[PDB]
Amino acid sequence: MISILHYGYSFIMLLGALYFYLLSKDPKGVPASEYLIAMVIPLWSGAAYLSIALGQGLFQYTTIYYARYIDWVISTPLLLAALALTAMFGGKKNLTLLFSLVALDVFMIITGFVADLSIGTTKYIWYSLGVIALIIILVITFGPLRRIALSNGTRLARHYTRVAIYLSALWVCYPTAWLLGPSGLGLAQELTEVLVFIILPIFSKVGFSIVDLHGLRKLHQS
Amino acid sequence: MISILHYGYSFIMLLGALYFYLLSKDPKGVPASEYLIAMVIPLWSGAAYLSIALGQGLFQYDDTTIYYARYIDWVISTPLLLAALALTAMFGGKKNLTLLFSLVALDVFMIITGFVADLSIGTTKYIWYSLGVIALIIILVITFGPLRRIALSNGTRLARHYTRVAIYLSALWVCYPTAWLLGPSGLGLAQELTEVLVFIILPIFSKVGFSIVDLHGLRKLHQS
Amino acid sequence: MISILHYGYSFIMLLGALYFYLLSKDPKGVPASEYLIAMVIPLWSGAAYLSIALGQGLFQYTTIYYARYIDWVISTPLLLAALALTAMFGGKKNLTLLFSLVALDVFMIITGFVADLSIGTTKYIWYSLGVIALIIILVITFGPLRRIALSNGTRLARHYTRVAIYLSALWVCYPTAWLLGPSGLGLAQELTEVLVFIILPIFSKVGFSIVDLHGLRKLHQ
Numbered sequence: 238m239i240s241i242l243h244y245g246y247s248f249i250m251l252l253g254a255l256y257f258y259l260l261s262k263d264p265k266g267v268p269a270s271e272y273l274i275a276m277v278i279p280l281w282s283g284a285a286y287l288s289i290a291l292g293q294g295l296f297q298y299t300t301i302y303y304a305r306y307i308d309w310v311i312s313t314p315l316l317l318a319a320l321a322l323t324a325m326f327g328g329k330k331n332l333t334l335l336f337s338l339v340a341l342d343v344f345m346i347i348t349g350f351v352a353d354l355s356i357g358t359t360k361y362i363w364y365s366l367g368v369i370a371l372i373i374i375l376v377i378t379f380g381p382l383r384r385i386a387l388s389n390g391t392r393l394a395r396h397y398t399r400v401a402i403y404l405s406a407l408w409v410c411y412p413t414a415w416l417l418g419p420s421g422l423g424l425a426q427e428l429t430e431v432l433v434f435i436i437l438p439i440f441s442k443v444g445f446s447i448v449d450l451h452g453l454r455k456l457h458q459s
Numbered sequence: 460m461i462s463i464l465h466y467g468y469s470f471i472m473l474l475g476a477l478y479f480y481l482l483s484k485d486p487k488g489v490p491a492s493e494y495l496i497a498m499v500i501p502l503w504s505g506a507a508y509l510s511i512a513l514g515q516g517l518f519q520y521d522d523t524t525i526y527y528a529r530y531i532d533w534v535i536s537t538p539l540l541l542a543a544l545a546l547t548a549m550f551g552g553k554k555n556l557t558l559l560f561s562l563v564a565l566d567v568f569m570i571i572t573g574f575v576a577d578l579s580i581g582t583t584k585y586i587w588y589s590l591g592v593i594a595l596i597i598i599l600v601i602t603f604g605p606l607r608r609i610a611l612s613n614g615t616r617l618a619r620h621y622t623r624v625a626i627y628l629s630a631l632w633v634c635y636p637t638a639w640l641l642g643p644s645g646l647g648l649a650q651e652l653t654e655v656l657v658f659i660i661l662p663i664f665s666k667v668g669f670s671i672v673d674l675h676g677l678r679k680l681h682q683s
Numbered sequence: 684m685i686s687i688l689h690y691g692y693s694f695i696m697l698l699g700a701l702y703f704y705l706l707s708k709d710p711k712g713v714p715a716s717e718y719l720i721a722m723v724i725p726l727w728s729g730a731a732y733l734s735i736a737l738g739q740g741l742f743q744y745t746t747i748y749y750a751r752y753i754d755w756v757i758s759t760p761l762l763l764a765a766l767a768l769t770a771m772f773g774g775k776k777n778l779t780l781l782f783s784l785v786a787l788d789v790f791m792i793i794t795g796f797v798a799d800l801s802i803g804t805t806k807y808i809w810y811s812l813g814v815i816a817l818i819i820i821l822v823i824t825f826g827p828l829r830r831i832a833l834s835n836g837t838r839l840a841r842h843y844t845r846v847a848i849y850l851s852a853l854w855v856c857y858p859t860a861w862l863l864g865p866s867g868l869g870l871a872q873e874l875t876e877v878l879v880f881i882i883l884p885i886f887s888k889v890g891f892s893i894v895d896l897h898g899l900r901k902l903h904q
């Protein structure tokens with residue numbers, strides 16, 4: 238079942254990527270960079286999850302699904318780049334703030350991988366450092382990055398706020414599931430965790446970019 | 460012989476790098492970025508191939524030898540080659556860094572699928588290989604489609620140079636997956652030594668030859 | 684002792700990062716990018732050294748403190764980015780020159796890691812390539828990068844020269860200690876090398892950015 242769930246996930250990622258490609262051909266004032274990011278996220282995630290479907294992107298250590306961290310260390314900084322570019326839509330870019338989010342996010346994913354390879358107190362030290370990074374990402378998202386969005390007008394700021402809440406609600410679920418599942422407290426079964434880390438990322442990747450791209454495209458004049 | 464071939468390759472990479480450095484000192488309207496890219500490609504490749512010459516950048520796996528240092532080479536040198544190609548198309552005009560990074564992403568993916576295919580067996584190997592070939596097809600579609608249209612937007616003379624470089628690169632690059640499939644990593648029709656020689660000769664043309672053709676052509680556009 | 688030294692180091696890195704964050708809130712004409720670089724360097728290094736403190740970022744092979752290379756491959760190109768941005772302060776950026784330093788530096792760290800995994804002549808081939816990369820970094824630092832600093836006026840060039848000497852003096856210590864210690868000739872003891880690679884980087888990361896940011900901030904008035 239776990240293999241078939243990952244094949245299904247990879248197929249959905251491919252369909253999402255093809256949909257964003259089709260949208261990119263009639264871009265409605267959204268820059269090509271947003272369409273590229275929206276395609277790379279699911280194609281990379283799809284490849285990483287295909288490796289799990291094929292029985293390659295996991296090892297016994299309990300099963301470490303290490304291909305999830307290979308996925309996230311690329312897909313999650315790109316999702317924050319997408320969020321930042323939405324805040325900056327129609328205005329000056331702040332690439333310093335964008336790269337601040339990239340740095341926090343790459344660190345967060347690495348601490349999760351090291352936490353997964355760790356045992357005892359050590360595991361929860363790494364986990365806690367990753368949670369601290371996520372807290373700072375959310376502080377930036379609802380603080381300075383939101384102030385940039387507000388500077389780009391009512392309609393853009395409304396859309397940014399929707400995308401920021403959508404992202405934040407889904408992202409807090411990842412460390413929650415991690416802690417409850419086999420990598421942490423071992424309260425939830427492996428299959429439960431697998432389903433959560435199939436369904437969450439469908440919404441976090443393809444769902445996020447449908448919401449984000451549709452909302453930006455709606456701002457288009459003629 | 461295999462060790463000596465790799466030492467020889469690394470020496471040729473170093474000579475190429477020194478030549479591009481000397482050209483960079485009298486740049487003839489070509490931006491410093493193009494000279495830097497042209498030097499990083501052969502120096503990185505030369506270091507990776509030095510690791511093979513020293514007996515380090517390879518291991519035994521499925522009874523075959525995986526020359527893993529080739530993938531360490533290509534995952535850096537090949538996206539830089541497409542960046543060089545893209546910057547040629549954009550010469551004298553607005554840069555499209557979105558298209559350039561599209562090529563970088565496709566290319567890094569392509570090299571990673573090759574490495575994973577090499578570590579794989581059976582149907583799994585050809586799934587990864589096939590995904591890398593699809594990435595190369597999309598790179599070539601970009602090269603002869605939208606990237607060529609950018610070159611044409613920069614005028615007849617630039618577009619003539621771009622088209623020459625695009626054909627040169629494309630002709631060499633389609634050889635890599637062809638050799639890979641025929642050789643020990645794939646169907647095992649071609650012998651290890653044949654594959655070693657192909658993956659010594661091809662990259663001399665793909666790296667140093669490409670940047671000689673590209674930089675000479677760009678420098679020729681300069682009026683002194 | 685080795686574990687406690689690494690915990691202490693990680694704590695000093697955290698305090699440095701928090702100090703640079705506080706400076707960033709009243710930036711005195713220094714761009715946000717400089718404060719971001721100044722924070723990433725010690726936080727990344729702190730995390731890498733925490734892995735050693737916890738007994739994770741090392742293996743027996745001699746002990747390879749592999750977490751040092753994970754640290755340096757990110758922290759050292761960022762330090763050269765900081766140095767390059769200082770030279771370019773108040774003028775046009777030369778990102779080609781900056782990325783030239785990044786490329787040489789990442790290569791240098793990788794040769795050190797490969798040298799550490801190597802034995803005999805092979806070890807010293809990789810080590811020598813890394814030393815050549817460092818010499819080119821220093822030639823750039825005191826040649827073309829210093830000429831950019833001089834183009835940005837007397838006060839900036841005075842500050843740049845101070846931070847270039849500070850960085851250069853510390854950086855030449857790393858390959859010297861590496862060669863003398865267990866990874867090289869094995870003349871210096873493991874504990875001596877551990878202390879050198881605790882003290883040097885405190886000056887190379889937090890000390891460097893205190894000197895750099897204080898000097899740039901002083902140019903505001």
Ligand SMILES: CCCCCCCC/C=C/CCCCCCCC(=O)OC[C@H](O)CO
Pocket residue numbers: 490491492493534535538539542546554559563567
């Ligand atoms: C294991 C994973 C490895 C990851 C692999 C990473 C690849 C590194 C290189 C990428 C392409 C570089 C892009 C080049 C940037 C564009 C240059 C540019 O903008 O040039 C401006 C102009 O030419 C000057 O005046």
Ligand SMILES: CCCCCCCC/C=C/CCCCCCCC(=O)O
Pocket residue numbers: 270310311314315318322330335339343
């Ligand atoms: C091993 C960890 C590797 C992490 C690499 C980072 C992954 C890719 C994400 C990078 C951030 C992309 C930022 C794009 C900025 C676009 C700016 C613009 O559109 O003008």
Ligand SMILES: CCCCCCCC/C=C\CCCCCCCC(=O)O
Pocket residue numbers: 270273274277281311554555556557558560561563564567568
């Ligand atoms: C590991 C595979 C993916 C790694 C690379 C991902 C690249 C995609 C992300 C960023 C695109 C950057 C676009 C820059 C836009 C600037 C404006 C322009 O000139 O078009």
Ligand code: NA
Pocket residue numbers: 271318319320321322323449
């Ligand atoms: Na967006």
Ligand code: NA
Pocket residue numbers: 493542543544545546547673
């Ligand atoms: Na070019």
Ligand code: NA
Pocket residue numbers: 717764765766767768769895
């Ligand atoms: Na600086």
